[PDB]
A paper describes a structure:
Cas12a (formerly Cpf1) is an RNA-guided Class II type V-A CRISPR nuclease which cleaves DNA following recognition of a 20-nucleotide DNA sequence containing a protospacer-adjacent motif (PAM). Unlike Cas9, Cas12a directly catalyzes precursor crRNA (pre-crRNA) processing to generate a mature surveillance complex whose crRNA bears a hydroxyl on its 5’ terminus. Using single particle cryo-electron microscopy (cryo-EM), we find that AcrVA4 recognizes the conserved pre-crRNA processing nuclease of Cas12a and the specific chemistry of a mature crRNA bound within the enzyme. This specific association serves to position AcrVA4 proximal to highly conformationally dynamic domains that are locked by the inhibitor to cage the enzyme in a state incompatible with dsDNA binding.
Under our experimental conditions, the AcrVA4 homodimer assembles with LbCas12a-crRNA into a distribution of two complexes at equilibrium: a monomeric LbCas12a-crRNA bound to the AcrVA4 homodimer and a heterotetrameric assembly of two LbCas12a-crRNA complexes bound to an AcrVA4 homodimer. Taking a subset of 79,786 particle images identified by 3D classification, we reconstructed a 3D cryo-EM density map at 4.9 Å resolution representing State II. Using this reconstructed map, two copies of our high-resolution State I LbCas12a-crRNA-AcrVA4 structure were rigid-body modeled to generate a butterfly shaped dimer of dimers. Each copy of the LbCas12a-crRNA complex is held against a CBD of AcrVA4, with ɑ1 of each AcrVA4 protomer forming the heterotetramer interface. Assessing the local environment surrounding the AcrVA4 dimer revealed that the two Cas12a molecules do not make any direct contacts to each other, suggesting that the interaction between Cas12a and AcrVA4 is due solely to the CBD contact interface. While lower in resolution, this map of the heterotetrameric complex included additional density not visible in our higher resolution State I reconstruction, enabling further de novo modeling to extend the CBD ɑ1 helix as a poly-alanine sequence. Although EM density for the unmodelled N-terminal domain (residues 1–125) in each AcrVA4 protomer was clearly present, it was not possible to model this region of the AcrVA4 dimer due to the limited resolution. Intriguingly, the ɑ1 coiled-coil domain projects away from the interface with LbCas12a-crRNA and makes no additional contacts with either Cas12a protomer. This analysis of the heterotetramer architecture suggests that, although visually striking, the contacts stabilizing the interaction between AcrVA4 and Cas12a are limited to those observed and validated through inspection of our State I structure.
Numbering used by the authors:
A (entry chain C), B (entry chain G): 128 to 233
C (entry chain A): 1 to 82, 91 to 246, 250 to 279, 293 to 534, 542 to 560, 576 to 581, 682 to 1074, 1085 to 1226
Amino acid sequence: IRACIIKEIDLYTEQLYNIIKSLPYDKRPNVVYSDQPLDPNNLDLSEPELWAEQVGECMRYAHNDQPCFYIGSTKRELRVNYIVPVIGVRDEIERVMTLEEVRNLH
Amino acid sequence: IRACIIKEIDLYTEQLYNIIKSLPYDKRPNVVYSDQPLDPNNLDLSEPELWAEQVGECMRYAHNDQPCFYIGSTKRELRVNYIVPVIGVRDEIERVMTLEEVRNLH
Amino acid sequence: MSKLEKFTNCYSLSKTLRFKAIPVGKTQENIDNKRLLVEDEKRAEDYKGVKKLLDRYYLSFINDVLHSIKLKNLNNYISLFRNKELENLEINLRKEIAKAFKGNEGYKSLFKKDIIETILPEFLDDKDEIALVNSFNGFTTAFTGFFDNRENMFSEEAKSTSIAFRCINENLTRYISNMDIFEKVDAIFDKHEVQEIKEKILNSDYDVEDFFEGEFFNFVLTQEGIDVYNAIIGGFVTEKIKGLNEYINLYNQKTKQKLPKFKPLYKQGYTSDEEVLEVFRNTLNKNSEIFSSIKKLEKLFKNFDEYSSAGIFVKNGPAISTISKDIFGEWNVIRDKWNAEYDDIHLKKKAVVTEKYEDDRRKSFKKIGSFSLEQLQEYADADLSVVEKLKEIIIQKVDEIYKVYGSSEKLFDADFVLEKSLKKNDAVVAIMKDLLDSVKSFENYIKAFFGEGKETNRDESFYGDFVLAYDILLKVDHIYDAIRNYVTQKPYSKDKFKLYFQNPQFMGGWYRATILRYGSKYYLAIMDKGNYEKIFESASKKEVDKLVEEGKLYMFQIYNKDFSDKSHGTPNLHTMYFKLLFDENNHGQIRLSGGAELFMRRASLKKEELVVHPANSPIANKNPDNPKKTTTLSYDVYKDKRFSEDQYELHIPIAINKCPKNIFKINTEVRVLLKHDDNPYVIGIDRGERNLLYIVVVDGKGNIVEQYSLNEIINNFNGIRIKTDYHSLLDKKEKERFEARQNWTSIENIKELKAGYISQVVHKICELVEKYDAVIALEDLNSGFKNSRVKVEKQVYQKFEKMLIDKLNYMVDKKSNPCATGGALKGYQITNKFESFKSMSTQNGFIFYIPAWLTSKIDPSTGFVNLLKTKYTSIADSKKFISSFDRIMYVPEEDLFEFALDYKNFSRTDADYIKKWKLYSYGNRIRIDWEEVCLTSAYKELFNKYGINYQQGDIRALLCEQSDKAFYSSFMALMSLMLQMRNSITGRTDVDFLISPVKNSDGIFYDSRNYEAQENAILPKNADANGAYNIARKVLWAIGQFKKAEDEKLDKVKIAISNKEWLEYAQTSV
RNA sequence: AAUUUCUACUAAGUGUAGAUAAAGU
Ligand SMILES: [Mg+2]
Ligand SMILES: [Mg+2]
């Protein structure tokens, strides 16, 4: 179950990368970021570690071509590996957007 | 094992779609096509159903946003769902290219 | 006959061009096969070891020379201390100390080659570290800076970091106060009691009272003397021996009386998340030294009333404003009470309040050392006790500290493990930053109660405990700085080490180093122990490449992205400087002075961390003002590719204008040229609230030649032109800072973005200067304030002024021909070299520093300025206000209200010149949560709502009969917002117009909204354009003053324009 | 998002525009 969960988490973040790569920077969503795989089907809020910020650049790791995302500005150097779009500004997160509500942005 | 295999087969074909969508039509590889998931890690040749032809257009299914590929010309209406790039022209297939030998094409 | 053409070749200047050296051929494996990069890294790592050894030897020498010293002026100090007969004596004492230091027979060796060659390899006598001190044999120059800084302690300049200042200014005061406290706290003692055991266990030879004698201070100069004295003070285990302070605590606990305790004398970056977190846990846990200091200060400030209020003090400065804010309502209440009590003595029965009088009052105030608590109690009101409010606010701060501790129980327990890295984790850094911020806010707050120190009747019963606790607490400053500098740290690093190549005398001239060149490639050839061009005897490329293959040569290639073959745009400035080093048009302007330096930076980013933009994939563009919204490159874009490899940096010094000829004084030549000129332009710069910087160029008669915002920097290239809105970038960064958990990194990002912005504005202002031959006009940052909405703060504006001075020392146009006036070879020198942030005042070559008083809230067409005080205080004050107008009537033709005043009848209105203004209710004003208000309709509404006719005329008498308390409040409110010129909606909506209530000679009120919808406008478009316009008109007044004087009295003409003269100019120029 | 180094970039495709006095403390 752990192998399939990681595969789903990575396919979802690869699709998110391929989507978000083309939106203009002023349209990027507010997301919840981390370094362990993030599972939108089970992700529940009220955890005191989820902070909704906005995606920046979208680049590829040079050694294994894994997508990584810079939260906020690139100059902030807050590079994460797994994100998930949310409707939130702070610790008050409302709901989790889907792979088509992010395409409607532009 | 079947659930993870299908997930890998689909993540691979989604990456292949996202890659092949941007190459000019004269650079597209020669591929082996089918409707059941294709697994490059185990795919063995000499099966009398593998015919290497060239990818055409790359569109999305309107009902569930699943990538589909038109083998040969679009006007031929040979639309498949799972492909795999190969170095071959006929029933004499040499080897299976990778997700970076297809990016080197252009 | 232009002005600038005379200010070339004035004085000399020096720069260092930094480059990158690329090993050519097989130089890198010829270097790795001789290991010429491990000796030097080992030496760079042994530098710190030899630094510590030199520090230890310095400490030995200090404790040696501080043994053979006995002063003859110390008894005079103690006799006269317990305003000018003492400072001469204390500087005599410090001079005596410094002469005792510099008078030894060994001080000569302390900062030359002898201390590495002979002394330190003998003072140590350890075969392990004699290896260290012998490795740096012949490399004494590597310490030149260290020595030049490690001698400022043996001096007497009394700066905060020096041995003399520590021993005298900070120690002798405490020694004298300790003499006092011992004279007071006595006869509770016996030889049978703890007195004899103190002597026996810690001294064993002479009495303990000898350490409170006068002329025995020449015993606590040595660190061991300080140690034994602080031992008998506090207690020193050999059997835990109690000290004098806790004997006092034992007495004050036996019976209840707050008896003073003695004061002890003074004593003369992290690299891993675990180290940082354990330092945090150690210094700031709930049983540390700092938390105990906080508990002690809490018990003190909650026992704050049993200390005599006449003994406490509060320092004079920002602390007074904050104390008034927290106690007496808001910012300025203590200041105005002091000004009232100063007028009641130094002001006659007349209303003759002059700007000179106000300035002398301000100076007398700012010179007051500190305020007692009984004084601040006299300034208070009935039933308000100032000590109770201070105690309650300090207890609130302490309880907030305790609350943050209770919110942060988790970072102290031993089970805690770090999931993510510290720089990427922001919950734990938020916790640490909140704790450090609260604790340092408390520390900076209670810093006030140390009221100047030098004063007579200090309540030592309180100050003993206070300093005992505070001298442990102020370590939070270093902890805060360390943790912050660790968190705000780039993932790469620029740590390098100089390469010598087994040669102490290496590269120091043009040594074994030469600069070759071939075609359009410049090479650095270093001999060890086709056709080129030597720098001009030629060579043969074949045999030099043969030397490179052999090993007899170390050819590097000097390179930056302008020497590339795919570079087509304009080269950098320093690239042009370098290329000119070897040019023909360069005669002696830029020459090669000194020796270069070849450093070496190791790869800081592991190639497993390298992140790339994959090729043939459309990249999004980050510039909203860019037409092209994507980019597809045929190659890869690595992020920070420069820091993922080893790079041989090369620092090359250059001396511009080494042999000047047009030597003269720049300021006086500027004054003479501005005098003899018939139409000198002036560029006024002002810090706005909606614009970062705003430019207004004004000719020699007050006519606006240009006025535009510096919001967007415009880069020209290839004929194309693309703009960048730095205001929007700054707003984005501030929004990100509002979203982030902690804002240590956001603040540094904002600072560096602002630095880049001012680095663009520098070029903007220079190309503005070399277009009109204009003269710049900047706000004098020493005196003035900007009301917290101005984006560019004072620190970054000071950095901007410094950057402008450093640029205008040698102004270059990159696009211009080099040998042409204004090019790199013949740049303009229209400013003197920067000295200090305090000497940036009243002139600098082409730069005039101007006070920003009465520049934005002034009508630019009439000179009007609201000098009234329209704040409601009571019925009587508002009645007198209303009764002070010459006439108040309703003009029915215009449907307005005229308020014919006369500035003679009003207080503090002496600067004005045209004292008889007539101002109407024209237009609409935006009050402040904002609300738009049409003035005449508001007046009619108020009048009708309180039953008042106004068509009569001169309704002043009809108006001061209202008995209601709120009528005059509303009236003075809208009378205050009628005189509000700068109106702006708070919620960022760009409406920053500037209306005036008076009409000019032609009879039309100035309204900026009539000039914002225009290009080629004659009056300011908004309040910030008004600020720049007035900052330019002040320099125009100074130019007129120059025109009034003769060609020898020009140097003495004062140009610090006073409020009287400024208002006179602004009101008659029209 | 490439840089002697900094800022904003991608700016016409291995770069653009401006600035840059390094070392040491
Ligand atoms: Mg350039
Ligand atoms: Mg950058």
